[PDB]
Symmetry: C4
Subunit: 76 residues, 4 copies
């Protein structure tokens, strides 16, 4: 290799595989998040809601308690 390309390669090898791992993991969870939305769709088509209440209208107390618990977990 040229001197400069040898330097570039030495820099990159310190984290090339780390970025590869992150990319692959992000693809897995992207895929899982898509599957999760399909399952909500099928479940809610089979068990429809009379009204769909989103958090900008009213936040369920259960959602609020879960958010507070996790917020405190992350602080701890």
């Amino acid at each position: 290799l040229s001197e400069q390309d040898a330097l570039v390669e030495k820099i990159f090898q310190r984290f090339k595989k780390t970025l590869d791992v992150i990319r692959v993991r992000a693809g897995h969870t992207d895929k899982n998040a898509q599957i999760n939305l399909e399952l909500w769709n099928a479940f809610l088509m089979a068990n429809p809601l009379p009204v769909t209440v989103l958090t900008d209208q009213h936040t369920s107390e259960s959602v609020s308690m879960a958010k507070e618990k996790v917020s405190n977990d992350i602080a701890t």
Copy 2:
């Protein structure tokens, strides 16, 4: 260290730990996304759907409203 390796190490230390954190977080959410799919599986085996309607057939109005709300949130 050699001069070149001292440079490589100085470059890498600016973000080594940032990549480590990202990798570890991506592993956590990868794990959680897998657990989430297992829970859907157990729930739906215990409470099966007569028909499974995916979004390429029909999108539940509840899913559509949630997607629009979040799309507007991200725009804001």
Copy 3:
């Protein structure tokens, strides 16, 4: 380009697009995770819980079994 900027650009081109992909994927799953929380909110407002039991009080056996299964999957 200057010599130094040519070096900087050669280094960066080894992973610029990899970081772009990761950023875009993380935005997608961030968006999906927000939609997922809205759907829980709407579902639980339509089907409320008499009590909301979080994992720091009691972990459902179903959640515990899913966590053990996925933990063993990742080990394998």
Copy 4:
């Protein structure tokens, strides 16, 4: 700055903020994935399963159809 530190800083500024964004997004979805698991826990404690069937025992047809749909989406 020294010459070498000026080079290090020029390299890093090409993607410092990109990594910061990824780190922050991964923290958001990590948090949301934790909230999601708490909501499953509360829901399943209020609506328990007589048996918890995980995918290594039997995969629900609904889960299988969602996985195939998303697999084909990603291929397209």
